[model samples]
Target: EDTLEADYLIETPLDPARVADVMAGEQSSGARSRASVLRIEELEAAARPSLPNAWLERQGTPGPWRRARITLSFPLANIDANLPTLAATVAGNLYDLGEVTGVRLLSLRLPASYRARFELPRHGVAGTRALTDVKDRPMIGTIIKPNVGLSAAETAALVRELCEAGVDFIKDDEVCANPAHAPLAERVRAVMSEVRRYRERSGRPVMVAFNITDDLDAMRRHAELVEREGGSCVMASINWCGFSAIQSLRRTTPLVLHAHRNGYGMMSRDPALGMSFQAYQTLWRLSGVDHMHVHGLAGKFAQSDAEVIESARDCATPLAAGCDDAVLPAFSSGQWAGTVQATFDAVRSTDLLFMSGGGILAHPDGPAAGVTSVRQAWAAVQAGTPLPVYAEHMPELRRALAFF
Candidate 1:
């Protein structure tokens, strides 16, 4: 019943106004598929002339290349509600245009009627909370340390310790998916045995996102095994699988899809080029990913705290009005009790996945104390009290502040 809009930065030596139509025409189908150039505003001139001019012209040269922000809207009829076709419509042919030097996809917006054509997350924030039975605060999560090379029993042993230590969520590291050393068949069974035993004894259901990333055929097999083993979640390196495979995985499995963005930096690190998280997550959300990694405040990664905050907000915001399409934003990397207060101030929401590797395992007291310290930190922020002041009564928090 509508159209979808995308914003882009068109950088060129020629006037950006002249470059817009070339972009729209190259990717569009015919007369009916042309994108309407809704807005174009001259923004800034580049500080230094870039390489696109030479590769583009070879012999000819020009100076004072400028930038303009252009917004374009395409009819939904053009794509027939297909995800891969939608991507090609907006991003495919525009980059190779001789009329422009550089182009970066900034963001996307879709009408409610059009959005209904795509897959919505099977377990959004609310369903994730329901599965773990964690309420009133951010769910504390952690990863399998050392990333890979652990045998199935060794990995299960670590999960068992984390179970007793009181972690609400445990995710398989992205690199650990379907490894020869620890195939998912053995890993899923071993991990779920620990998770089920803990739930039986302690009455606390902990969600484990098993790494089941592979080709569509293999992933389907792995996902089916996880479902049979009483697992609640399966994770994938979303960028590697691409849209079609991920969409198929979502359609095949009822288990939660925890999307890991391990290769995002390759697409996002450059400020002048590449897709921003807003556009990137929008495409992934349409593939029905239940959880998205949004780095963390004061993270070990290169992304700034401000970028992380914006990414988290993007994950929570619905793709279209009157629909609940928000996926859970999973925050991780160098996070701990020490970094919790700042994250709370930025996102200002309890609905998030707070994960730590060393933050929970490297605590001087123990893994249990590490988990307790992170939990206490969140409680301290909720009370609107300074962490150190609250730490006066919280030994776990106090020790964490001192040690970390």
Candidate 2:
């Protein structure tokens, strides 16, 4: 099969010194598109001048990264009245800009009014609260770790632990696609049934996000299975599957859809050209996704605090009348309870799912203790007590107080 090629023009501030350092020499070209796209390797290798080193350094450190406004101009042809392309270009590019550190999108400048046709988050912060039955506080969640190799019984044991820990939500790892050792049908039935029993005993509604993200046909079948079994949520790796898969699932599935942005970074990392995160988010919302995972600032992966906030804003932004549903912005990745205050502030008043993988499972005392720590941190934020002060009463928080 042959792939079609598209032409793109990219413009960046000229820095001769930086150019000289990264590239052997400057060459003239009438095609801005060719110079920017074909020579990206040379551009990336160029000296630190055009590179976002200072920005990356500022964010990679422990200190707070403040939000700054940005302005962007996209080719008019790229700007469509449709949701898919709009999101791919906007949110997709934002994902790339965030990768650069110092650069961020302050505003979107379109050739014409996109507001009339563009649909934002159908189920954003408020709608997510309604769907999850969580109010007046952040939703708590945990991940099954050790890299998705556990058997049904093994994975079920972890689910029991998290359920007993009193966490509100549980999700499978990105790689957990129901391995042969633990087939999807059996694992889904086992985990959900056990969690339901635990919820009944404890009087807390626990939701488990099953990873049913396979091929389009398989994904649809899995969604039906999860819904039929009374599952509350299902996780989908939207980036891995085509856009149509998510659109179809959202239309046919009844469960709260949790979107995993698994492989969107590669397209978004280059500043000279790429779609913005703002664009991708818009499209996902329209696809009927209920919640979307955006990396947190203090996570295992490196993302500036401000970058996280931008995602929060995208999730909370208003949408058209029919498209109105709050999509809960999920903050994940190497997140700890100690970082709750900062995360809360970064996300403002929007409803959020503060999820952790090792942060909850790797607690010194154990998984239960980790759950307690994360809960207390959110409680502290709600009560207007700083995380430092809240740590005084929380043992786990006390242990990792300075780590976040």
Name the top lDDT candidate: 1
TM-score of each: 0.97, 0.73
Q: Which candidate leads in TM-score?
A: 1
What are the per-residue Cα lDDT tens digits for candidate 2 across 81-140?
A: 555564454344332332233332223323214443433334445555665577888888
Residue-wise C-alpha lDDT for candidate 1, range 85-191, written one tens digit per residue: 88888877776677666788999998888788889999888889999998899999999977999999999999999989999999888889878888889989998
Any idea what lDDT model 2 has?
0.64
Off by over 4 Å in 1: 50-53
Point out where model 2 deviates above 4 Å.
1-9, 12-127, 319-326, 402-404
RMSD of 1: 1.3
Q: lDDT values of the candidates?
A: 0.88, 0.64
